Amino acid sequence: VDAFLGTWKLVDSKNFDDYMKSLGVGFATRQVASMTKPTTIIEKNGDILTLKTHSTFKNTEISFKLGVEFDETTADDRKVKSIVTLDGGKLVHLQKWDGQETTLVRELIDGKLILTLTHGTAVCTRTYEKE
């Protein structure tokens, strides 16, 4: 887990609109989100990880242990059952609600953090650089 820790800033985004549309996010929220560049902070205290996502529009914070389910309320106000695991060196976050699922996968490639978001047929790639 240790290579993920730190402060990251968004530098590139592809197909986030498609992703948000698939989740049912309304057009006005999609407008603002398309212009927002969040900062993600990942910290550890023992076995507990904390993931903070900060922006001018909305802020979220979750704390969790790897491999243990937790309740999460997402930025778009879904109430989901989540689990985060390490798989092939990737941090894989699975959210389940109402029989649906979405995955948020983070991988480090060339020192950058690549976040891939999948729901239905929509696939979004967001690139973060370390601050």
Question: Measured between alpha carbons, how far is 92 from 20 in angstroms, rounded to an integer?
Answer: 19
Report which DSSP code applies to 56: S
Question: Measured between alpha carbons, how far is 25 from 58 in angstroms, rounded to an integer?
Answer: 14
Q: Which is nearer to ligand STE, 46 or 49 (CB)?
A: 49
Q: Which is nearer to ligand STE, 7 or 29 (CB)?
A: 29
Least separation in angstroms between CB 87 and ligand STE? 19
- Is residue 53 involved in binding ligand STE (CB under 6 A)? yes
Q: Out of 7, 39, 55, 127, which residue is the one contacting ligand STE (CB under 6 A)?
A: 55
Question: Measured between alpha carbons, how far is 75 from 73 in angstroms, rounded to an integer?
Answer: 7
- Is residue 25 involved in binding ligand STE (CB under 6 A)? yes
Q: Which stretches of the chain bind ligand STE, using CB under 6 A?
A: 20, 25, 29, 33, 36, 38, 40, 53, 55, 57-60, 74-76, 115, 126
